[PDB]
Design a protein around this motif. Structure first.
Motif, PDB file in Angstrom:
ATOM      1  N   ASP A  69       0.821  -1.213   0.000  1.00  0.00           N
ATOM      2  CA  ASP A  69       0.000   0.000   0.000  1.00  0.00           C
ATOM      3  C   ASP A  69       0.855   1.263   0.000  1.00  0.00           C
ATOM      4  O   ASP A  69       0.449   2.285  -0.567  1.00  0.00           O
ATOM      5  N   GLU A  70       2.036   1.216   0.629  1.00  0.00           N
ATOM      6  CA  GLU A  70       2.847   2.419   0.778  1.00  0.00           C
ATOM      7  C   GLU A  70       3.304   2.981  -0.557  1.00  0.00           C
ATOM      8  O   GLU A  70       3.675   4.157  -0.625  1.00  0.00           O
ATOM      9  N   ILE A  71       3.293   2.180  -1.617  1.00  0.00           N
ATOM     10  CA  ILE A  71       3.621   2.658  -2.948  1.00  0.00           C
ATOM     11  C   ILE A  71       2.381   2.744  -3.840  1.00  0.00           C
ATOM     12  O   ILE A  71       2.239   3.698  -4.605  1.00  0.00           O
ATOM     13  N   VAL A  72       1.440   1.804  -3.711  1.00  0.00           N
ATOM     14  CA  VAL A  72       0.331   1.735  -4.664  1.00  0.00           C
ATOM     15  C   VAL A  72      -0.642   2.893  -4.451  1.00  0.00           C
ATOM     16  O   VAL A  72      -0.992   3.620  -5.397  1.00  0.00           O
ATOM     17  N   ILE A  73      -1.106   3.076  -3.212  1.00  0.00           N
ATOM     18  CA  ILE A  73      -2.100   4.117  -2.943  1.00  0.00           C
ATOM     19  C   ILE A  73      -1.590   5.511  -3.288  1.00  0.00           C
ATOM     20  O   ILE A  73      -2.279   6.229  -4.029  1.00  0.00           O
ATOM     21  N   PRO A  74      -0.422   5.958  -2.808  1.00  0.00           N
ATOM     22  CA  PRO A  74       0.052   7.290  -3.220  1.00  0.00           C
ATOM     23  C   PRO A  74       0.133   7.450  -4.714  1.00  0.00           C
ATOM     24  O   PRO A  74      -0.219   8.511  -5.241  1.00  0.00           O
ATOM     25  N   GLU A  75       0.601   6.425  -5.426  1.00  0.00           N
ATOM     26  CA  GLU A  75       0.800   6.593  -6.862  1.00  0.00           C
ATOM     27  C   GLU A  75      -0.517   6.511  -7.623  1.00  0.00           C
ATOM     28  O   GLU A  75      -0.697   7.228  -8.609  1.00  0.00           O
ATOM     29  N   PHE A  76      -1.444   5.652  -7.178  1.00  0.00           N
ATOM     30  CA  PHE A  76      -2.775   5.595  -7.788  1.00  0.00           C
ATOM     31  C   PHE A  76      -3.488   6.934  -7.652  1.00  0.00           C
ATOM     32  O   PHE A  76      -4.100   7.426  -8.610  1.00  0.00           O
ATOM     33  N   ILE A  77      -3.414   7.536  -6.462  1.00  0.00           N
ATOM     34  CA  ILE A  77      -4.017   8.848  -6.244  1.00  0.00           C
ATOM     35  C   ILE A  77      -3.360   9.883  -7.145  1.00  0.00           C
ATOM     36  O   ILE A  77      -4.040  10.716  -7.758  1.00  0.00           O
ATOM     37  N   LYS A  78      -2.031   9.828  -7.268  1.00  0.00           N
ATOM     38  CA  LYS A  78      -1.346  10.729  -8.189  1.00  0.00           C
ATOM     39  C   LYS A  78      -1.913  10.611  -9.601  1.00  0.00           C
ATOM     40  O   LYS A  78      -2.004  11.609 -10.323  1.00  0.00           O
ATOM     41  N   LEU A  79      -2.295   9.398 -10.015  1.00  0.00           N
ATOM     42  CA  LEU A  79      -2.852   9.201 -11.350  1.00  0.00           C
ATOM     43  C   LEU A  79      -4.209   9.881 -11.521  1.00  0.00           C
ATOM     44  O   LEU A  79      -4.625  10.132 -12.656  1.00  0.00           O
ATOM     45  N   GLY A  80      -4.913  10.167 -10.430  1.00  0.00           N
ATOM     46  CA  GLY A  80      -6.256  10.698 -10.505  1.00  0.00           C
ATOM     47  C   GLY A  80      -7.327   9.738 -10.057  1.00  0.00           C
ATOM     48  O   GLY A  80      -8.506  10.007 -10.286  1.00  0.00           O
ATOM     49  N   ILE A  81      -6.963   8.618  -9.441  1.00  0.00           N
ATOM     50  CA  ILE A  81      -7.964   7.701  -8.913  1.00  0.00           C
ATOM     51  C   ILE A  81      -8.520   8.296  -7.624  1.00  0.00           C
ATOM     52  O   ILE A  81      -7.759   8.789  -6.779  1.00  0.00           O
ATOM     53  N   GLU A  82      -9.845   8.298  -7.490  1.00  0.00           N
ATOM     54  CA  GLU A  82     -10.467   8.813  -6.280  1.00  0.00           C
ATOM     55  C   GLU A  82      -9.861   8.117  -5.062  1.00  0.00           C
ATOM     56  O   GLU A  82      -9.698   6.887  -5.080  1.00  0.00           O
ATOM     57  N   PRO A  83      -9.473   8.865  -4.017  1.00  0.00           N
ATOM     58  CA  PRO A  83      -8.749   8.244  -2.885  1.00  0.00           C
ATOM     59  C   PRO A  83      -9.445   7.042  -2.272  1.00  0.00           C
ATOM     60  O   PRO A  83      -8.780   6.048  -1.969  1.00  0.00           O
ATOM     61  N   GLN A  84     -10.764   7.088  -2.092  1.00  0.00           N
ATOM     62  CA  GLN A  84     -11.455   5.919  -1.563  1.00  0.00           C
ATOM     63  C   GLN A  84     -11.259   4.710  -2.465  1.00  0.00           C
ATOM     64  O   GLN A  84     -11.110   3.583  -1.978  1.00  0.00           O
ATOM     65  N   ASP A  85     -11.271   4.926  -3.785  1.00  0.00           N
ATOM     66  CA  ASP A  85     -11.041   3.837  -4.729  1.00  0.00           C
ATOM     67  C   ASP A  85      -9.603   3.341  -4.658  1.00  0.00           C
ATOM     68  O   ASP A  85      -9.360   2.131  -4.685  1.00  0.00           O
ATOM     69  N   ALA A  86      -8.641   4.263  -4.595  1.00  0.00           N
ATOM     70  CA  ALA A  86      -7.244   3.868  -4.503  1.00  0.00           C
ATOM     71  C   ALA A  86      -7.010   2.998  -3.282  1.00  0.00           C
ATOM     72  O   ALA A  86      -6.265   2.012  -3.349  1.00  0.00           O
ATOM     73  N   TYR A  87      -7.660   3.334  -2.156  1.00  0.00           N
ATOM     74  CA  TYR A  87      -7.520   2.522  -0.957  1.00  0.00           C
ATOM     75  C   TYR A  87      -8.147   1.153  -1.123  1.00  0.00           C
ATOM     76  O   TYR A  87      -7.804   0.238  -0.374  1.00  0.00           O
ATOM     77  N   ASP A  88      -9.037   0.985  -2.092  1.00  0.00           N
ATOM     78  CA  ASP A  88      -9.733  -0.277  -2.289  1.00  0.00           C
ATOM     79  C   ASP A  88      -9.071  -1.167  -3.339  1.00  0.00           C
ATOM     80  O   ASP A  88      -9.680  -2.147  -3.777  1.00  0.00           O
ATOM     81  N   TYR A  89      -7.841  -0.865  -3.747  1.00  0.00           N
ATOM     82  CA  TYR A  89      -7.223  -1.621  -4.827  1.00  0.00           C
ATOM     83  C   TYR A  89      -7.026  -3.085  -4.446  1.00  0.00           C
ATOM     84  O   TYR A  89      -6.921  -3.445  -3.269  1.00  0.00           O
ATOM     85  N   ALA A  90      -6.976  -3.934  -5.473  1.00  0.00           N
ATOM     86  CA  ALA A  90      -6.669  -5.345  -5.315  1.00  0.00           C
ATOM     87  C   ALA A  90      -5.448  -5.732  -6.147  1.00  0.00           C
ATOM     88  O   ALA A  90      -5.014  -5.011  -7.053  1.00  0.00           O
ATOM     89  N   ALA A  91      -4.883  -6.879  -5.808  1.00  0.00           N
ATOM     90  CA  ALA A  91      -3.965  -7.541  -6.712  1.00  0.00           C
ATOM     91  C   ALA A  91      -4.768  -8.207  -7.822  1.00  0.00           C
ATOM     92  O   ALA A  91      -5.877  -8.698  -7.591  1.00  0.00           O
ATOM     93  N   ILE A  92      -4.217  -8.202  -9.034  1.00  0.00           N
ATOM     94  CA  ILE A  92      -4.822  -8.859 -10.184  1.00  0.00           C
ATOM     95  C   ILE A  92      -3.824  -9.860 -10.717  1.00  0.00           C
ATOM     96  O   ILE A  92      -2.661  -9.510 -10.927  1.00  0.00           O
ATOM     97  N   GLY A  93      -4.271 -11.098 -10.938  1.00  0.00           N
ATOM     98  CA  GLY A  93      -3.396 -12.103 -11.501  1.00  0.00           C
ATOM     99  C   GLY A  93      -2.200 -12.359 -10.612  1.00  0.00           C
ATOM    100  O   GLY A  93      -2.307 -13.071  -9.610  1.00  0.00           O
ATOM    101  N   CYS A  94      -1.061 -11.757 -10.949  1.00  0.00           N
ATOM    102  CA  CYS A  94       0.172 -12.007 -10.205  1.00  0.00           C
ATOM    103  C   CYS A  94       0.535 -10.838  -9.300  1.00  0.00           C
ATOM    104  O   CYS A  94       0.252 -10.863  -8.097  1.00  0.00           O
ATOM    105  N   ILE A  95       1.171  -9.811  -9.851  1.00  0.00           N
ATOM    106  CA  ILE A  95       1.643  -8.695  -9.042  1.00  0.00           C
ATOM    107  C   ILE A  95       1.023  -7.365  -9.435  1.00  0.00           C
ATOM    108  O   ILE A  95       1.136  -6.400  -8.663  1.00  0.00           O
ATOM    109  N   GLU A  96       0.397  -7.269 -10.602  1.00  0.00           N
ATOM    110  CA  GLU A  96      -0.204  -6.025 -11.053  1.00  0.00           C
ATOM    111  C   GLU A  96      -1.361  -5.651 -10.131  1.00  0.00           C
ATOM    112  O   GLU A  96      -1.881  -6.485  -9.389  1.00  0.00           O
ATOM    113  N   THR A  97      -1.762  -4.375 -10.171  1.00  0.00           N
ATOM    114  CA  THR A  97      -2.788  -3.881  -9.252  1.00  0.00           C
ATOM    115  C   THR A  97      -3.803  -3.012  -9.983  1.00  0.00           C
ATOM    116  O   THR A  97      -3.479  -2.329 -10.963  1.00  0.00           O
TER     117      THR A  97
END
Lengths: 808, 808
Positions: A414-442
């Motif tokens: 989370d310490e890398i995914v959430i900050p960077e997802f939010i930087k992309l423009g993902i709504e913060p609540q959504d960024a906090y709700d991210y999952a792993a997909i397949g192997c390592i992608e998110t």
């Protein structure tokens, strides 16, 4: 403290039955039915045609209930059979139909009857498949590139997209009938004299057809559970069949009420997604979150369900996930060792509750983690979202399961995914709700398009070789981008001009890779709409179009860049030994490369390249930062492009980088000639973003230092770090606190993307190669996923054996 | 003073050969070739596939040169053969294949070999035709409506669109090679990582394929002219074949230099437009304008071409236009009596030169008008643009040709078209450049989409009958829009409630007609791109898409409203005799209608409806303005809709009204029960916007007064006014100045849309019905076009015979 060694006889028998199917069959029912419905519904719009295809196939295919399972729903006619999906391609099928039984690591049994069906069905599809339509549109240059293998989009031309998690919360909240009402409300706003509504109506109609078919299909299993119960002698099993039939009748229409109901509905959707489409990395998302309300009530609050029985339900589901199968071509199977489906389950992480982050770990997280430790299956691909506030208790339970030796759980951060997802423009609540997909992608499950990763592959090593040699690709003999400088000409004036040539070449192959993806994505968009999958992703119903047309709330994709360690290690060696020292001449290196370092003289040169220049993975800034700088060119190039959904609905519509290349390092290496890091021609490249095997000599903390120097924030497709330990190194509690501190420092200090641990002995893997009938349940972690070792080809096996063994 | 009785033996022989082909053959070469290329190029995008189809067919089809023609290029393998176009439909072909020889007025000869080809070719197309794909998308309601015939879109589902003029000036200015450079310049701006450019590139590629094929096809005829000359005994003919081969070689690539070159290039495009597509009303536009520069040089300035030889060139072209043929279903043939192609040639009008209007009549206008008077063929459909400043000299020449008895020229009116086109937003210079298309409709040639008119047909009479009777359509027994009021219930409280019911019903059928057009237009858009036609219309190349996708600079379309006189005459009778007088009861009228006025009592009622209430066409405001008010509802409804190209490129993207219904009055009447104007069930409705036959008793000036009271400005699809005179009425110069003053007053004072004159004797049409082998060249004006009388069905013949004979 987890009980990780106990399995019911139900689960053991089922699990043992699956692990012993070693040449799984091919099923042709779907291929027949889709051919029949395409033929009869040539007049219908493609999404309607495809919806009627799925409806026909579900209503007429073989269904069954086996192994006294508590979660029901088969993918194909036989156990672990791979269905056939002709609309993507029939090219490799027609070439390989007689030779499927003996492909190393990818052998399937085609019965004579099924061979006859395929020989009638496949010729009809010629010219009409995604792959044929791609080649109908590629320029000659694009065709030439693909023929070399320097760029590859084989996984996209021969398969559905998938690589996402559907909106399971929406499904659980509304049930199938409430989705139907949602569709009806939306069709009520169609104006058939508005062009966009004319098209939207066709897609909404197709969704309704499919929803109806899923409701009817669940009822079909309910009727099967009853008919089987009326001949079930054992009382206890017969009460199970009854409760399931009762449960199916409810979830066929209404929001599920019980945890056992909720899990079965989720599995039903998970399964049918992989009947309408053979795309893999269909992922469950944060099941410990959206199933917790049912778990809390049934298991904790009303105590109407035994936590041991709940774990037994999960186990049944996991074994159903192992039943899901998929056949690939001879070529693409080498890039996916172990017949993987990559069905991910994310647990842990946090939740943005009223703008404040909160630990998301709950008892279901624990019960899920424990159920996987007990089962030690390759499915599901269990992923933990680490965060700074994750407890020592939970992180200890994770290590307890890492100890069990089947490669799981792996860790996202989370310490890398959430900050960077939010930087992309993902709504913060959504960024906090991210999952792993397949192997390592998110990705944000339920709100994201396909392919967070899984777009085109570029062989970085071959591009680099061409940059060192006039644009010439030694494997193919082609020069797609001519340049004047070449080692054989000795006309490089300094190493800066070598970097220029790298920059110039990779800018060319990146553009061509995007051009190729544009063709493939568009052919998928027009030909193979996923009706159910679109229906269950925000905001496809409202927008009245498919995910591939722009329906998803968010759309970012990444391709795969292969040969990471080899790029850095190779540049660092020619920089030091050729240019900084003059110890090796330009024409001399080129001659050794063209010769595959043959002869004792070139072999001595090769060993100087191997050990007299620094290697990525030893915490040496001179090579690590040169690698980051080489990669940075590709990452910067990506910024000038938009993906095909850009401007058509989703937020983003852009690209980022990715390194989850699975086992492509082995076949990509096979087509890569000798490289200046001392690698022999045709030998594997390094996998993922891992150090080349045997080059990392300063321990694991030096590895994670090297890895951390990559531009992780730009590689949101994921930076893959494999690591291998001998079981003894994890035997003691101080060995445990060692590893735990290494994890937290990696994630909190180095902002690392991901880590997974292989705990296996070199003796075990050697013995199993010799006697596979013994270790049919031995699981090994390959690259982002775990697999049964006895089901791997010798090539893939030895790549695992050749990996560095580290010490904590 | 025109010499209108002289023809060369060349032209006479050719013309006589054509008029004597009375059961023309069907050619299947195009159907074979398109089937072959669709099958081999299933992988290509549809426009590319269709381009390769045309290229294959042109290179492999039978070509020939016959009748010592000066303009070369055959449409099909045999003379006047109709090609077959399976991509639009094979439905009527499979039903009627064995019964084509004896359809009254639409008989074709299908050789046994061609029957066998069609029986192999047609089953492949099932499910893939425009018409099948329409029925794959229609709602059930839309299907029901179409089944009744109250709405019809048969001409759009079974045919290409056409109904336009291509940009002949652009073609003449650049030549084929300059179009190629235009395409290349545009492809140079394609970015293959931009989605719209990916699609644009496919369309631009298809255009280039086709341009190449047209260039090669012209060269193929050049080689044929040479091979035939090497065996041509007569010197003079052999010098002609040589000059033509020389001319073809030039126009295959370069801008034409000579008038004979310019005409042949124009014809080549005119012909190939009708090979790639069977859409009719392919029109030449203002040929007297864009061919004048060549005429002025060759004929006036350098006198290198004899004006008599130029007329001979035109005659050759006109006979080639008669060679163009088209087969239709049994049903749609009844709506198009006389196998018409409606190939229009516009002469006269004005030109906006530096913002100032100027008379556009020139010597070529005269030579064209004269060439048509000499030839008296049904093709081309010659249309004069009248304007206030048109000279008495030219208007006298026009009447001189009207005297020749073949129905031409007809008249459009600048005084109404230009002001209203400008009101729409057409650039004034463009509005001044408008042409006639097909029959009476108008558009800006080279810059307009398809179908200025030719969209869906609505039977106004049947809608009115349903409005008088609960929404019940007596022909079908259906009630698509239920309403409570019905004559049989006597529950109408006053005539205002009858108008309410008309307004309500026609608002329903208008919406459904637009919904149906949306489906058909979209299926055409996706399946049958016209590559050459799009290439030659602004601004398709720049926008890199087809006309049907929004490529055209302007896009306005109209449908056809049928039963105009019957609507007004029927409402006026029930208003007066039922409501204003109580002379006739509601249940009484309804019983007579349901009975088809059977019995002597109902027959007396019927004669009271016929003669005791005013009829449209007698300058009686009470009926004329009631008709305008009834029509006005439909016109207002149209304002709430946009056509499918709206917002996708063109200016406009809207609908307006249209009355050019050809001979649909006869089959539409066949499915219309008895109407309150006294019309018997199954008998013809009135054609166009003409008075019902025999109801106009106060002379032609009263007719044009009635017609002028329609909302002409809203009926930009055209208001069709037929009128019939006995030859004696036009014999004298004072009979001439009579007619001329009637024309100018109609156009300048009444702002009338159009007029055409039939000059024929009731004895001639009776004798010809008896002895057709005698009058194979007798031409009669039907509705907007002229036709060979002996080629009409008896039904169509008698409708002409039944028309009012007027006196000047």
């Amino acid at each position: 403290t987890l009980k990780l060694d106990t399995l019911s006889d139900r689960i053991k028998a089922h699990k043992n039955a699956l692990v012993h199917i070693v040449k799984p069959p091919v099923c042709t029912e779907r291929a027949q039915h889709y051919t029949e419905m395409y033929q009869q519904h040539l007049d219908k719009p493609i999404p309607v045609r495809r919806a009627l295809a799925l409806a026909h196939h579900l209503a007429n295919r073989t269904i069954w209930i086996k192994h006294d399972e508590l979660i029901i729903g088969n993918q194909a006619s036989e156990v672990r059979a791979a269905p056939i999906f002709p609309e993507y391609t029939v090219s490799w099928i027609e070439k390989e139909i007689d030779d499927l039984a003996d492909r190393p690591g990818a052998g399937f049994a085609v019965s004579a009857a099924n061979a006859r069906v395929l020989h009638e069905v496949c010729p009809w599809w010629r010219g009409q498949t995604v792959q044929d339509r791609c080649y109908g549109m590629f320029t000659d240059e694009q065709k030439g590139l693909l023929a070399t293998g320097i760029i590859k989009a084989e996984g996209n031309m021969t398969s559905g997209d998938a690589h996402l998690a559907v909106n399971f919360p929406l499904l659980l909240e509304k049930g199938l009938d409430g989705l139907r009402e949602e569709v009806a409300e939306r069709r009520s706003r169609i104006n058939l004299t508005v062009l966009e509504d004319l098209h939207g109506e066709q897609f909404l109609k197709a969704i309704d057809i499919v929803l109806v078919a899923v409701s009817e299909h669940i009822e079909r299993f309910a009727a099967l559970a009853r008919e089987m119960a009326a001949t079930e002698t054992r009382e206890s099993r017969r009460d199970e069949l009854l409760a399931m039939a009762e449960n199916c009748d409810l979830i066929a229409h209404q929001p599920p009420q019980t945890f056992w109901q909720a899990l079965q509905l989720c599995y039903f959707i998970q399964l049918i997604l992989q009947i309408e489409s053979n795309g893999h990395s269909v992922s469950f998302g944060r099941m410990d979150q959206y199933l917790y309300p049912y778990y809390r009530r049934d298991v904790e609050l009303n105590q109407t369900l035994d936590r041991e029985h709940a774990i037994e339900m999960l186990h049944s589901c996991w074994l159903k996930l192992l039943e899901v199968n998929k056949i690939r071509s001879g070529s693409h199977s080498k890039a996916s060792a172990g017949s993987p489906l990559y069905q991910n389950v994310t647990i842990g992480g946090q939740n943005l509750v009223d703008g404040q982050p909160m630990d998301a770990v709950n008892p279901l997280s624990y019960a899920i983690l424990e159920s996987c430790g007990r089962l030690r299956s390759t499915q599901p691909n269990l992923s933990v979202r680490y965060h700074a506030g994750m407890s020592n208790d939970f992180l200890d339970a994770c290590v307890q399961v890492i100890r069990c030796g089947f490669g799981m759980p792996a860790f996202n951060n989370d310490e890398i995914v959430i900050p960077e997802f939010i930087k992309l423009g993902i709504e913060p609540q959504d960024a906090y709700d991210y999952a792993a997909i397949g192997c390592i992608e998110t990705a944000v499950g339920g709100k994201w398009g396909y392919r967070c990763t899984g777009m085109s592959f570029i062989n970085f090593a071959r591009v680099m070789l061409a940059a060192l040699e006039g644009g010439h690709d030694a494997t193919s003999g082609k020069v797609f981008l001519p340049q004047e400088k070449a080692l054989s000409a000795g006309n490089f004036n300094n190493f800066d001009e070598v970097m220029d040539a790298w920059d110039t070449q990779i800018r060319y192959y990146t553009r061509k890779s995007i051009e190729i993806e544009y063709v493939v994505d568009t052919m998928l968009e027009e030909n193979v709409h996923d009706i159910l999958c679109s229906a269950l992703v925000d905001d496809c119903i409202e927008r009245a179009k498919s995910i591939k047309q722009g329906g998803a709330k968010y759309d970012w994709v990444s391709g795969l860049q292969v040969g990471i360690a080899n790029l850095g290690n190779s540049l660092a060696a020619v920089k030091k030994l050729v240019f900084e020292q003059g110890a090796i001449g330009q024409q001399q290196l080129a001659a050794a490369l063209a010769d595959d370092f043959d002869g004792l003289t070139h072999e001595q040169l090769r060993q100087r390249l191997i050990n007299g220049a620094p290697k990525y993975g030893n915490d040496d800034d001179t090579v690590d930062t040169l690698l980051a700088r080489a990669y940075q060119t590709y990452i910067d190039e990506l910024k000038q492009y938009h993906n095909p959904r850009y401007g058509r609905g989703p937020v983003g519509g852009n690209y980022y980088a990715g390194t989850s290349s699975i086992s492509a390092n082995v076949p990509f290496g096979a087509q890569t000639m000798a490289t200046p890091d001392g690698r022999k021609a045709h030998t594997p490249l390094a996998e993922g973003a891992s150090p080349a095997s045997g080059t990392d000599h300063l321990g694991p903390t030096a590895v994670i230092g090297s890895v951390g120097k990559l531009p992780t924030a730009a590689i949101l497709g994921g930076v893959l770090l494999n690591q291998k330990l001998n079981p003894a190194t994890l035997e003691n509690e101080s060995d445990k606190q060692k590893l735990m501190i290494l994890l937290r420092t990696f994630f909190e200090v180095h902002k690392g993307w991901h880590i997974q641990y292989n705990i296996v002995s070199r003796e075990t893997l050697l013995d199993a190669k010799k006697h596979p009938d013994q270790y049919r349940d031995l699981v090994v972690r390959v690259a982002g996923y775990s697999a049964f070792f006895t089901a791997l080809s010798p090539d893939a096996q030895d790549d695992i054996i050749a990996r560095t063994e580290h010490m904590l």
